Design a protein around this ligand. Structure first.
Ligand SMILES: NC(=O)C1=CN([C@@H]2O[C@H](COP(=O)(O)OP(=O)(O)OC[C@H]3O[C@@H](n4cnc5c(N)ncnc54)[C@H](OP(=O)(O)O)[C@@H]3O)[C@@H](O)[C@H]2O)C=CC1
Ligand SMILES: NC(=O)C1=CN([C@@H]2O[C@H](COP(=O)(O)OP(=O)(O)OC[C@H]3O[C@@H](n4cnc5c(N)ncnc54)[C@H](OP(=O)(O)O)[C@@H]3O)[C@@H](O)[C@H]2O)C=CC1
Ligand SMILES: NC(=O)C1=CN([C@@H]2O[C@H](COP(=O)(O)OP(=O)(O)OC[C@H]3O[C@@H](n4cnc5c(N)ncnc54)[C@H](OP(=O)(O)O)[C@@H]3O)[C@@H](O)[C@H]2O)C=CC1
Ligand SMILES: NC(=O)C1=CN([C@@H]2O[C@H](COP(=O)(O)OP(=O)(O)OC[C@H]3O[C@@H](n4cnc5c(N)ncnc54)[C@H](OP(=O)(O)O)[C@@H]3O)[C@@H](O)[C@H]2O)C=CC1
Ligand SMILES: Nc1nc(=O)c2nc(CNc3ccc(C(=O)N[C@@H](CCC(=O)O)C(=O)O)cc3)cnc2[nH]1
Ligand SMILES: Nc1nc(=O)c2nc(CNc3ccc(C(=O)N[C@@H](CCC(=O)O)C(=O)O)cc3)cnc2[nH]1
Ligand SMILES: Nc1nc(=O)c2nc(CNc3ccc(C(=O)N[C@@H](CCC(=O)O)C(=O)O)cc3)cnc2[nH]1
Ligand SMILES: Nc1nc(=O)c2nc(CNc3ccc(C(=O)N[C@@H](CCC(=O)O)C(=O)O)cc3)cnc2[nH]1
Lengths: 265, 252, 253, 264
């Protein structure tokens, strides 16, 4: 009783929605955040008000860089994130790799390039690798009698992977590595009954820092409804794949994109 | 309003689990069968004992062959028409009925072509077209709010079962139907998706399944079909969901 | 001198495939349905360059019976492959290129379209591959050729359906399934089976959307790829589809 | 006057066959290497004996680490590889991202961080900085003086959907390399730079194991029941670089004898 979910980047948008949907199914939730301390503490208050000691927050930079209090490597920051679930609640049944940087890295016209690469690949790919390693190590270190009955890892990927967004090469590479992680971890962790799946949004909760015609033009291209998704239209799929009814699904990436990946220029 | 689901090959195995699953969600279900009349009728009796007027059975050969002439198109149209005649609506279509047997490359090949392609591909196309036409012909204020078509595909499509070429071709066509009808029917808010089992309710290779080293139960597949029809899945369309316990991840 | 059977060979990509294969030394069997004049003019051209290097054979590849007991699509397909063995004693390459292509809208006569689009694009390739494979298996091992290749012309844009073309889109997906299934099952006979998928090629606006060059392709930009896949240098390639689309499948709306 | 190709990891096996195959078509080849200096210099001597001034060798660690000086970054090392082509021959027309470390990183059980940097560097990040450096030098060339057939080939993996057990970082990096292939092909199409992939299945399998075990692996390939020769892969790379392939971009060609069609 009281399964525990770890959701990275849980403070806002899709990750907040995922944490809420998991909390609504009875999970205690560990809300990871990087820079959004206010929103993460506000969400924690809301969920703890519904159920005392059902949400906590942990801060971590998931870029592939070392930090300071010897320097602290990304891998041990990820190990410590999983550790916060077992320390507080004695378990971790669900891990959602949701946190993600996303900005252009154009090929056509150096501290920027160096920090872009660690940031985008760490957050979207390498920290997921380390977190899965930490999550799976902990299941392995748990006596079988004490293991949970429904371990589930979700990687937030991208429905539009075969149709790249112009000028976003590092991001697209990182989401491709994340799909590779989904398949590889699914295979390798199957004997522990840890399922690993991907959920791929198309356009979801689209930021509108552009002229109104440009924003409406973007959304209008989604065949189903001619709009971007809501946060829940994505997070409800995450919550299903973690549910026990999804127990035979692993290594699978589910598009939640309104048909947008079906389109062509 | 009680929504209606048409499930083909509903009498046994996955199709029965899909009919039972939608019925537990509150659907009235049209149970299509070909030869399993006794089984279909017994399933209908069970579901109607639970909720009166919640199940009917209809029979039809979904092979691509003229019947006694009645064409496959006409038989598929009448199947959708059965739902509208009995309940005035059809909200969900599950294209589950499917013949499966070898057509090795190295009149019985023409019977196999019409049977394997009809059930797995050509009948689903007519059924989808009939479902779409009835929705379009319905005044927009009287339309339902959660239209959903599920095609039962094959998670192992990229890894062909040796000797099953026509079956594999037909399931590849059904994936093409999924994508094309999802695109074209999006303006009517009809979602079109696939669910692809791996090894399920085998009647060996099951020890090779990475997750649990067994074929799936019926519910482990039908529970997914039910979710994709749920309104929580209403932004998913044009997508095929593998339910294979990772079997498609394997190699020889 | 090896032999290629090319369906729908009279014009456009099929004619360029036949020309490309012929230029590598192949004798070519030029299949046609309605374009008898174009097929026979092409045959005249290739035979003038190399005597007895081309023939032509007519067949409706729709999944329908034709009159002389009615003749089924299966039989007409068997007779296309037999035409190569009768005339030249071999058939080393089969290019499944013939294809009907027109709308079959789901929204806003259909038995004919089903038989025609699914026949040419999927069921006839299935029957032709079976006939082609039977003839190789029936050939004594010492007398088989050393480079059997089957090429199915598919569609680069298959994951991105063209609005209103459901039957065509379904048929090309069946054809990709046939490519994978036939490649696995015919591998012991060393018969390779691959696909080539154009995007927009030799169109009769949308051109500007192609990332590479902002144009549809020429016929040779496709047929050269077919020709390489049939070459001995490509002998380890089977069961795979090669996109030749200028990057169009990378685009989104 | 003579087109120039930069082949990473050119000293042995597939990279050497790719170098030989492009050289046979008339390319001058820059042969990159990391540890195999003897093998690289032997190959360059062979190519130069066949055709004077048709090969050079360059060393670089393509791991995502800083190297010995102010430290030298991976990007800098990557730009200097491409610049070596322009310094010596004035041009760089083809890039083959072939260099690749390959060993397990099991999920269950400094050498952790160096393996990530090495597997992710060789297979994904160094490809990226090499593609950018290559693209930058083309963009900087006046259109009057640009080459007419720019081609980038990424060596991917036909078995990407069917992961090798215990090889998670490798599998991830190749998945990233496929993303690079698609993204670079779209962004560099305006400069007529094509970007494609070639994915071997089992090629030139090392036989440092029991014979029965090596024959057992090989026998799983449906076509010929063997791993491929080096030329059976490199000939495809050379075709994709040819002008006959000039409408192909953004595409990954499996050269796997049907292995990806198999299941357990
Ligand atoms: N929304 C969409 O349209 C699409 C989304 N996706 C994927 O879905 C997931 C969520 O989408 P969305 O909710 O829009 O994602 P956001 O862009 O809102 O970012 C989510 C969180 O990622 C965290 N984050 C970013 N960089 C780092 C870092 N270097 N270290 C640690 N945390 C970091 C931030 O946490 P903080 O605020 O605490 O700094 C941010 O709140 C992502 O994986 C995204 O890639 C994929 C395709 C489309
Ligand atoms: N079970 C598995 O492991 C897998 C299943 N699938 C797919 O999932 C779906 C169901 O799986 P399963 O339950 O095993 O399927 P079955 O093989 O049990 O067949 C299901 C039903 O199809 C109907 N059917 C067959 N041919 C025709 C026809 N010509 N006309 C009309 N109805 C016909 C039969 O109805 P009747 O009995 O009334 O004649 C049969 O009961 C199918 O689409 C199948 O391809 C895909 C991959 C794996
Ligand atoms: N061109 C493009 O942009 C694209 C092409 N493709 C594929 O490339 C291949 C060739 O393309 P293209 O050259 O444009 O094809 P065409 O549309 O020109 O059709 C080629 C030939 O197919 C034959 N054909 C049509 N219906 C039948 C039938 N029922 N029975 C027998 N033969 C028939 C016709 O032969 P006749 O004239 O003798 O009647 C026609 O000349 C096709 O398979 C096509 O699907 C795929 C994607 C894009
Ligand atoms: N062979 C196969 O069966 C398959 C191969 N592939 C891909 O094809 C390509 C070639 O295959 P193969 O020839 O087997 O590859 P190899 O394993 O023989 O490695 C080729 C070269 O990579 C170079 N390399 C490795 N790590 C680094 C590094 N950190 N920095 C710089 N150079 C490095 C080495 O150069 P040096 O020796 O000079 O140090 C090595 O000779 C690779 O990309 C591989 O992933 C994909 C699937 C199957
Ligand atoms: N981490 C993450 N966060 C996101 O918000 C996100 N969004 C998408 C959805 N795709 C897009 C595409 C374009 C723009 C956008 O705002 N474009 C601006 C500037 C950048 C551009 O050139 O596209 C525009 O004006 O077009 C946003 C989201 C995909 N992955 C993500 N990943
Ligand atoms: N329509 C359909 N029915 C199924 O039962 C089915 N099963 C699978 C799962 N794959 C397989 C693969 C091999 C065998 C098999 O070995 N069959 C036995 C007899 C059972 C049979 O063929 O139905 C055999 O003797 O070959 C069964 C299922 C995939 N698609 C299906 N499709
Ligand atoms: N068998 C086959 N033949 C083809 O020509 C073909 N072409 C494509 C390329 N895609 C397309 C998409 C749209 C139109 C189209 O709508 N044609 C216009 C042309 C009218 C004009 O000349 O302006 C039309 O409406 O007829 C053609 C090709 C794909 N598969 C094919 N398959
Ligand atoms: N860079 C690279 N080099 C390769 O040789 C290579 N080979 C493959 C072909 N796949 C495989 C699969 C398994 C084994 C294997 O069994 N190796 C042993 C150790 C032997 C060794 O790699 O030196 C193993 O323990 O996995 C080798 C190659 C795929 N990618 C590659 N990538």
């Amino acid at each position: 009783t009281v399964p525990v979910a770890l959701v990275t980047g849980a403070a806002k948008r899709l990750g907040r929605s995922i944490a809420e949907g998991l909390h609504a199914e009875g999970y205690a939730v560990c809300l990871h955040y990087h820079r959004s301390a206010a929103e993460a503490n506000a969400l924690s208050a809301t969920l703890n008000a519904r159920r005392p000691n059902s949400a906590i927050t942990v801060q971590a930079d998931l870029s592939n860089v070392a930090t300071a209090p010897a320097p602290v490597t990304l891998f041990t920051r990820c190990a410590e994130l999983v550790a916060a679930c077992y320390t507080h609640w004695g378990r971790c049944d669900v891990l959602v790799n949701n946190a993600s940087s996303f900005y252009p890295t154009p090929l056509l016209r150096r501290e920027a390039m160096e920090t872009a690469t660690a940031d985008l690949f760490g957050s979207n790919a390498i920290a997921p690798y380390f977190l899965i390693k930490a999550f799976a190590h902990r299941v392995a270190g748990t006596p079988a009698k004490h293991r949970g009955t429904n371990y589930s890892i979700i990687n937030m990927v991208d429905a539009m992977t075969n149709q790249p967004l112009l000028g976003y090469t590092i991001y697209t590479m990182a989401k491709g590595a994340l799909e590779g992680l989904t398949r590889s971890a699914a295979l390798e962790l199957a004997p522990l009954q840890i399922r690993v799946n991907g959920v791929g949004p198309g356009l979801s909760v689209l930021v509108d820092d552009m002229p109104p015609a440009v924003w409406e033009g973007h959304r209008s291209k989604v065949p189903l409804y001619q709009r971007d998704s809501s946060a829940a239209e994505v997070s409800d799929v995450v919550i299903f794949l973690c549910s026990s009814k999804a127990k035979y699904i692993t290594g699978t990436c589910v598009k939640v994109d309104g048909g947008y990946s079906l389109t062509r220029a």
